[PDB]
Amino acid sequence: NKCDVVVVGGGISGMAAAKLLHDSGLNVVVLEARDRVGGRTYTLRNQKVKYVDLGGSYVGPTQNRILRLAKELGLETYKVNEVERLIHHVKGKSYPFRGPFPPVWNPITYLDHNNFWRTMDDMGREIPSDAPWKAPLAEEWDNMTMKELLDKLCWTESAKQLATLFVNLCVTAETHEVSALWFLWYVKQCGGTTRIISTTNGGQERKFVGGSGQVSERIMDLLGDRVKLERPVIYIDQTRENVLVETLNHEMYEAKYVISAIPPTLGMKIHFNPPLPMMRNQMITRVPLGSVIKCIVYYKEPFWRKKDYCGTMIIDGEEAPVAYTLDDTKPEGNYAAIMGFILAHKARKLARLTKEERLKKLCELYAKVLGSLEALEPVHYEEKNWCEEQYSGGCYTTYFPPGILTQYGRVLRQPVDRIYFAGTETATHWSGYMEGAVEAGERAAREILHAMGKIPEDEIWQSEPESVDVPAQPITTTFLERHLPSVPGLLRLIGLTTI
Amino acid sequence: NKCDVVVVGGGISGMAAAKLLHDSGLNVVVLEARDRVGGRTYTLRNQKVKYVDLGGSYVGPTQNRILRLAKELGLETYKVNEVERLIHHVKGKSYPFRGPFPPVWNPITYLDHNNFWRTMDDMGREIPSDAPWKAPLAEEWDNMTMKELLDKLCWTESAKQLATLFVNLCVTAETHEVSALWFLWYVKQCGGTTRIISTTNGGQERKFVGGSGQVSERIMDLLGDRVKLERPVIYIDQTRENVLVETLNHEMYEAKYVISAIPPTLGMKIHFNPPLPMMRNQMITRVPLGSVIKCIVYYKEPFWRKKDYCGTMIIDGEEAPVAYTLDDTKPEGNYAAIMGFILAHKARKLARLTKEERLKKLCELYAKVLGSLEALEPVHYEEKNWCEEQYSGGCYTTYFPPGILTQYGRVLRQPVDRIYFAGTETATHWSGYMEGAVEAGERAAREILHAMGKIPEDEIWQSEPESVDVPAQPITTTFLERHLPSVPGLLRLI
Numbered sequence: 001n002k003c004d005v006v007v008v009g010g011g012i013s014g015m016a017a018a019k020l021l022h023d024s025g026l027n028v029v030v031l032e033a034r035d036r037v038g039g040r041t042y043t044l045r046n047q048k049v050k051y052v053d054l055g056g057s058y059v060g061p062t063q064n065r066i067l068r069l070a071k072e073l074g075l076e077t078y079k080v081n082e083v084e085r086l087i088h089h090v091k092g093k094s095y096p097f098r099g100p101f102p103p104v105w106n107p108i109t110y111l112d113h114n115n116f117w118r119t120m121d122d123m124g125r126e127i128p129s130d131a132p133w134k135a136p137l138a139e140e141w142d143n144m145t146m147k148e149l150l151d152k153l154c155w156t157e158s159a160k161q162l163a164t165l166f167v168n169l170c171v172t173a174e175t176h177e178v179s180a181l182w183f184l185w186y187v188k189q190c191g192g193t194t195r196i197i198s199t200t201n202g203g204q205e206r207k208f209v210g211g212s213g214q215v216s217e218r219i220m221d222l223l224g225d226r227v228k229l230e231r232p233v234i235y236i237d238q239t240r241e242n243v244l245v246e247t248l249n250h251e252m253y254e255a256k257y258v259i260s261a262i263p264p265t266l267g268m269k270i271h272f273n274p275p276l277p278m279m280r281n282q283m284i285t286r287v288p289l290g291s292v293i294k295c296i297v298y299y300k301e302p303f304w305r306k307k308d309y310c311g312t313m314i315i316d317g318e319e320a321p322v323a324y325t326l327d328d329t330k331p332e333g334n335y336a337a338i339m340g341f342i343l344a345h346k347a348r349k350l351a352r353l354t355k356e357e358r359l360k361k362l363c364e365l366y367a368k369v370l371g372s373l374e375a376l377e378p379v380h381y382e383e384k385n386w387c388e389e390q391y392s393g394g395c396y397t398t399y400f401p402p403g404i405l406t407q408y409g410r411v412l413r414q415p416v417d418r419i420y421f422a423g424t425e426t427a428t429h430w431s432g433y434m435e436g437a438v439e440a441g442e443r444a445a446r447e448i449l450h451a452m453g454k455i456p457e458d459e460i461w462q463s464e465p466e467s468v469d470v471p472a473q474p475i476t477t478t479f480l481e482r483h484l485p486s487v488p489g490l491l492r493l494i495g496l497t498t499i
Numbered sequence: 500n501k502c503d504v505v506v507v508g509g510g511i512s513g514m515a516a517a518k519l520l521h522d523s524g525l526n527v528v529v530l531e532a533r534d535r536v537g538g539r540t541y542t543l544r545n546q547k548v549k550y551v552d553l554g555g556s557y558v559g560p561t562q563n564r565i566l567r568l569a570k571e572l573g574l575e576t577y578k579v580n581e582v583e584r585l586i587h588h589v590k591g592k593s594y595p596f597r598g599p600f601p602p603v604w605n606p607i608t609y610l611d612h613n614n615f616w617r618t619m620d621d622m623g624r625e626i627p628s629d630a631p632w633k634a635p636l637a638e639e640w641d642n643m644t645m646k647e648l649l650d651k652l653c654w655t656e657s658a659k660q661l662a663t664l665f666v667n668l669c670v671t672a673e674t675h676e677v678s679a680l681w682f683l684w685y686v687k688q689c690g691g692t693t694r695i696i697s698t699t700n701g702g703q704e705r706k707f708v709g710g711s712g713q714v715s716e717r718i719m720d721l722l723g724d725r726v727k728l729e730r731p732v733i734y735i736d737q738t739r740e741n742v743l744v745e746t747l748n749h750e751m752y753e754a755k756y757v758i759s760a761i762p763p764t765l766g767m768k769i770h771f772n773p774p775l776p777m778m779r780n781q782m783i784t785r786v787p788l789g790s791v792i793k794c795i796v797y798y799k800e801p802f803w804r805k806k807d808y809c810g811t812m813i814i815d816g817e818e819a820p821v822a823y824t825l826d827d828t829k830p831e832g833n834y835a836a837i838m839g840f841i842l843a844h845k846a847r848k849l850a851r852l853t854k855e856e857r858l859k860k861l862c863e864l865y866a867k868v869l870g871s872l873e874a875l876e877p878v879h880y881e882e883k884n885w886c887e888e889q890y891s892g893g894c895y896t897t898y899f900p901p902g903i904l905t906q907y908g909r910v911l912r913q914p915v916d917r918i919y920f921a922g923t924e925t926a927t928h929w930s931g932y933m934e935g936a937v938e939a940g941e942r943a944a945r946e947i948l949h950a951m952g953k954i955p956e957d958e959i960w961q962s963e964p965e966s967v968d969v970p971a972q973p974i975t976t977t978f979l980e981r982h983l984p985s986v987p988g989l990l991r992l993i
């Protein structure tokens with residue numbers, strides 16, 4: 001019934017917010033729609049897999065908040081396998097390589113590839129992490145899709161195709177679906193192209209031993225009876241002295257403040273009194289989540305390692321159901337597995353198949369890419385289609401279509417009377433990730449602590465010390481990477497020699 | 500408690516569906532979230548205005564369903580004033596004209612303008628009204644915004660600017676916000692560019708005497724106690740023999756079938772058991788409504804008529820709050836008024852002002868465009884910002900961002916077990932309009948009648964006889980309009 005703060009949503013963001021408020025001495029209640037906590041993280045346990053993350057999983061250097069929270073909860077990380085060679089599969093052939101980037105040998109294509117990634121980061125530097133709509137060319141960039149930007153920037157089909165794969169993989173959406181400004185912001189606020197794409201020294205460096213679901217589960221353990229499962233919030237009333245929060249199962253909760261720790265669009269599932277201000281009312285109809293099926297195929301042994309492949313495959317082509325894989329073998333070397341993402345339109349297309357049909361397609365793909373008949377002999381299979389989730393709306397996160405971020409972006413974490421907004425979508429560093437969830441939950445919590453006069457304004461936004469366990473190497477470029485001309489740049493240099 | 504069909508939403512679509520089912524002998528209940536019916540139609544009555552439509556208002560030739568429904572309810576139409584000259588205001592100067600199209604005098608600009616409108620209709624002819632995703636180039640066109648298409652097609656800034664205004668006015672959204680495929684479908688399914696833009700012989704020919712709100716109000720009168728106001732639906736349960744529909748005020752309704760007659764995205768306000776199928780689950784987060792403030796400025800007299808202006812103004816430029824106006828004077832010639840729409844980003848920008856501040860901006864604009872100091876002396880002002888409406892989400896209708904219509908379009912009116920889908924967004928002719936609302940409501944109703952074995956499959960989709968009161972003249976083109984080259988076509992000839 002009565003508490004200090006109602007937190008709506010028991011994902012990482014809501015749990016992090018509730019923990020901070022609980023630790024500060026406030027009475028908190030978490031109202032969670034599902035029969036479980038974790039939201040877009042979900043760790044399945046059974047005999048065949050031991051444990052497997054079916055949602056958010058990877059953490060890496062510079063994600064210091066999730067690392068600190070998980071450490072405090074008694075969790076440990078392990079390194080994703082990147083010992084052996086990566087594979088880039090393009091036009092039906094596999095090309096093994098080392099490093100974060102597939103090598104390009106053609107001098108023109110090389111210039112084009114180099115310029116693309118460089119320009120992405122160049123443009124990113126003009127975009128404030130906490131206010132992308134304040135970029136000097138915000139309107140121009142926001143009124144373009146990523147498809148249009150790629151069309152302008154890439155002078156080779158090879159660069160365009162790889163850039164397209166990158167967008168699909170990063171934001172589980174098609175290039176024509178998403179704003180260029182938003183996508184450029186998204187990459188920049190993760191620390192740039194190298195940081196976001198890398199396993200070693202990047203976002204995919206590590207996973208949690210036992211699964212990421214333990215973060216939310218262990219906070220629930222600490223909070224005990226304060227977490228209310230199967231309590232979908234349907235109604236928030238702010239007309240009276242205390243905020244009234246009603247659930248689908250007829251329960252009423254009274255609080256001084258509310259944290260909304262759900263994906264922005266899922267705010268639509270709540271009826272508000274009084275009605276939301278116009279900008280938020282419309283914003284929450286304009287911010288969809290992406291489309292993905294996470295698929296894990298299990299094998300007797302990590303046979304790819306014997307062929308000097310680490311299990312990472314970058315697979316281009318419309319025919320391939322999965323565009324990207326990682327070795328998902330346990331740190332102990334057992335429960336050998338390949339994790340793959342079925343992205344964007346392919347998630348839509350292939351969801352029509354049975355689980356068995358998808359497994360067959362994945363195995364046949366892996367067999368060609370790895371050039372191994374062993375890939376046709378899976379021992380087990382797990383998958384999760386996040387598009388079907390009423391209380392997620394998709395995965396990994398919310399994307400912004402053209403025109404939305406500049407018009408509605410400033411509303412995202414603007415308080416509505418006594419409602420404050422968490423959720424990874426409101427983060428300014430690794431928004432979209434578990435890291436962003438922690439940043440947002442704790443920031444929203446501190447906004448309430450400030451509103452109560454418990455902390456100064458200066459303390460709402462808090463810096464995070466670097467993890468000692470997961471140190472971050474700086475992102476470097478070579479002299480040539482910095483100064484080599486683009487394709488049109490080289491052509492302009494040829495045009496000048498003609499005179 | 501118990502009935503045959505629960506209709507969720509008491510706008511024109513829900514009311515039309517409920518009326519059809521009621522007339523067929525079924526027990527129907529309409530659950531309406533607001534303290535009123537009408538939804539995106541709303542007629543305000545007071546002493547100063549008599550009546551004024553603050554939402555949907557215009558009807559015209561080829562919109563035979565709304566005309567028939569309104570007639571049956573005892574409503575009449577009158578003609579919007581287009582006797583005198585229209586005005587095109589561009590680069591700070593007013594250019595009076597006659598006919599539906601503002602003239603272009605620069606020869607190259609003429610070719611470019613002509614080609615743009617012609618190409619819009621050409622492209623539309625390849626788009627099936629009932630399945631736009633089946634267009635031969637559906638994917639190509641859906642993966643482009645209207646901004647991109649305009650950038651490709653328009654060789655002059657003049658044509659591009661007017662085309663932009665057209666998009667903003669048509670769908671209350673920016674050109675960069677909307678799919679080219681969806682927009683081209685939208686125009687085609689209203690009967691093409693001329694039909695959609697025209698007052699005389701087009702969508703804006705007429706209004707209802709007494710206001711369009713009377714359509715929903717008069718059906719509510721017929722249904723009586725069957726319409727439940729202030730009953731926002733929060734929960735639909737289809738796991739049992741009968742469908743259970745729960746409202747915010749704690750009431751439970753049991754039915755054999757449900758019609759959802761709300762904007763697709765407002766389906767998000769309902770928790771579903773079992774969960775919606777994946778495609779619909781995601782679709783309803785991908786389909787926003789546009790942004791508009793409808794503003795009506797009242798004057799002592801329709802002074803513009805004295806200067807041989809009808810009151811229609813097409814106003815170019817970022818500075819102008821309103822891009823398009825019509826005379827909103829009563830058929831009797833009193834309650835003189837100019838109606839204007841504040842569109843898309845301007846609705847967002849100008850909503851920050853006070854009502855009085857917006858009035859001042861509108862009056863100053865009208866004084867400039869009409870060249871009349873009389874515009875600075877309003878006697879009254881009414882406005883409605885539809886962006887603030889929890890149970891509409893915007894106006895006039897739902898738009899599709901790039902990539903959505905091909906991926907999710909087929910889900911729009913696909914039944915989910917015993918839930919059938921109405922709402923103007925599911926119409927195939929004048930979707931977005933009151934006409935589409937009637938088409939969709941009656942079609943959804945008939946789907947249920949078929950499911951009950953009461954009518955054959957052949958009768959789900961029903962043709963509508965042409966209105967005798969509002970006859971449609973055919974849309975014609977001239978030989979030169981058909982065969983004059985585009986700008987790149989002329990350059991290829993050179």
Ligand SMILES: *[C]C1=C([C])[C]=C2C(=[C]1)N([C][C]([O])[C]([O])[C]([O])[C]OP([O])(=O)OP([O])(=O)O[C][C]1O[C](N3[C]=NC4=C3N=[C]N=C4[N])[C]([O])[C]1[O])C1=NC(=O)[N]C(=O)C1=N2C#C[C]N([C])[C]1[C][C]C2=C1[C]=[C][C]=[C]2
Pocket residue numbers: 008009010011012013014031032033034036037038039040041054055056057058059169170171196197198203204231232233234261262263266269270292293294324386391392394395396397422423424425432433434435437
């Ligand atoms: C799904 C997913 C997947 C599949 C994958 C992934 C992911 C996901 N991610 C993301 C994460 O997960 C996120 O971010 C988080 O989790 C979020 O959190 P938050 O914010 O908290 O949210 P959520 O969870 O959702 O929660 C919410 C809650 O609430 C609730 N509700 C609703 N509604 C309601 C409620 N309640 C009451 N009432 C009402 N009404 C619900 O239920 C819930 O619970 C991720 N992340 C990270 O970090 N990591 C990872 O890994 C992940 N993942 C992914 C990724 C991928 N990647 C990275 C890729 C690979 C390679 C590459 C990439 C990218 C880029 C480059 C490269």
Ligand SMILES: *[C]C1=C([C])[C]=C2C(=[C]1)N([C][C]([O])[C]([O])[C]([O])[C]OP([O])(=O)OP([O])(=O)O[C][C]1O[C](N3[C]=NC4=C3N=[C]N=C4[N])[C]([O])[C]1[O])C1=NC(=O)[N]C(=O)C1=N2C#C[C]N([C])[C]1[C][C]C2=C1[C]=[C][C]=[C]2
Pocket residue numbers: 507508509510511512513530531532533535536537538539540553554555556557558668669670695696697702703730731732733760761762765768769791792793823885890891893894895896921922923924931932933934936
């Ligand atoms: C808003 C608006 C405005 C401002 C204007 C306009 C409009 C609008 N429009 C549209 C109409 O209105 C529509 O379409 C209709 O109305 C629709 O119907 P429906 O489908 O039925 O829907 P609604 O109304 O929305 O209803 C729904 C209902 O439901 C309810 N709910 C929700 N949720 C819920 C509920 N319930 C229970 N539960 C829950 N959960 C609500 O409340 C409601 O009631 C229009 N239309 C026509 O026809 N006309 C007109 O006029 C209109 N408007 C406009 C237009 C414009 N224009 C035409 C322009 C001028 C010149 C030109 C143009 C365009 C193009 C070219 C040229």
